[model samples]
Target chain A: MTIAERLRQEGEQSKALHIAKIMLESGVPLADIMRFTGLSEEELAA
Target chain B: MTIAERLRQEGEQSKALHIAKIMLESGVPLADIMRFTGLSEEELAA
Candidate 1:
């Protein structure tokens, strides 16, 4: 099973997961996520 | 929210809980998903 996200990049799993955790816990905005992860509205909402 | 949007971003599920529905119902492979969305194996598993 493959899972896709917006803030993927070349780094450690902890780092990425940390960011994801922050997003999940903080309830960040979609637009901010788009800017940070290079994900479009469609991708985020996909 | 991006918390659980990974499935949607991976071109697998349909967006719901707001402006979408169960768009599709198919289990995609890990490699295919990597190719489809540039997601890594860790992310897919995560």
Candidate 2:
């Protein structure tokens, strides 16, 4: 499994969210974000 | 914290990703998805 996948399963939500934040600010698409972080649109918006 | 945020922190990736997938299929904008999911463009695209 990918490190991200493992991390996600291992309770690394903050790290995952941090990465997502970076990507989002960089103008990456939301569809891509979900695949990487496994976070839902509602979660991110929260 | 918001339910979505709680879910993410609770290691509910599958559920979160499920929501993101639905949003994407529903024609939501990438930006809007990111705002809600805390996921990045790369994650979704993958």
Candidate 3:
């Protein structure tokens, strides 16, 4: 699984959120991040 | 700063590790991950 998904699976949704932010800042496209992280844009933007 | 650089500066090395792994799994080339994440193959491999 992608790390974000793994994090969520492991009950670390909070950590997953943090990673998503980093992915965005590091220039990962939103579409890829959304797919890879399984995070909604709302959650990602939060 | 790149998110990885920011993460390192913020002492979020552990969290950065998770992101690096996910980047690798997502078919991001090692060269780009290296440039963007500042993670060496040894680190990425670990």
Candidate 4:
């Protein structure tokens, strides 16, 4: 069996973190964040 | 200044984080990240 590689894109971590921060701080609707961030509906609700 | 006075740009922040994460994970040089993320050279190196 071949091992699947799971590489995280450089700088993307900070980017995603910044996005989450903005959405959280801006009071953008969770639903909106879901659409924007590709985060699942459940996660957004939380 | 209004309380906190730091209304964040939702779209922009997300974009920034996404870019940063990519740069960090992809082994993009700190200099490159500095240029891309607007983060200081010192911070990028750290």
Pairs of colliding residues, candidate 3: none
Model 2 scores a C-alpha lDDT of 0.66
Give the per-residue lDDT digits (tens) of candidate 3, residues B1-46: 5644443444445545666777788788888666655567898888
Name the candidate that leads on DockQ. Answer: 3
What's the distance in Å from true for residue A30, model 3?
0.5
- Model 1 spans > 4 angstroms off: A1-25, B1-46
Model 2, span B1-46: residue lDDT tens: 7654554465654544555676689786888767666667887886
DockQ of each: 0.04, 0.11, 0.12, 0.08
Docking class of 1: incorrect
CAPRI-style class, candidate 4: incorrect
Q: Which ranking of candidates, highest DockQ first?
A: 3, 2, 4, 1
Task: Estimate, for each residue in B1-46, the C-alpha lDDT of model 4 and write its tens digit.
Answer: 4222222233344456555566587675666555545666554444
Deviation from native of the Cα of residue A10 in model 4, angstroms: 23
Poorly placed runs, candidate 3 (over 4 Å):
A1-11, B1-22, B31-46
How would you encode candidate 1's per-residue C-alpha lDDT over B24-43 as one tens digit per residue? 12343444334333445555
Better structure of 1 and 3 per DockQ: 3
Ranking by lDDT: 2, 3, 4, 1
Off by over 4 Å in 2: A1-11, B1-46
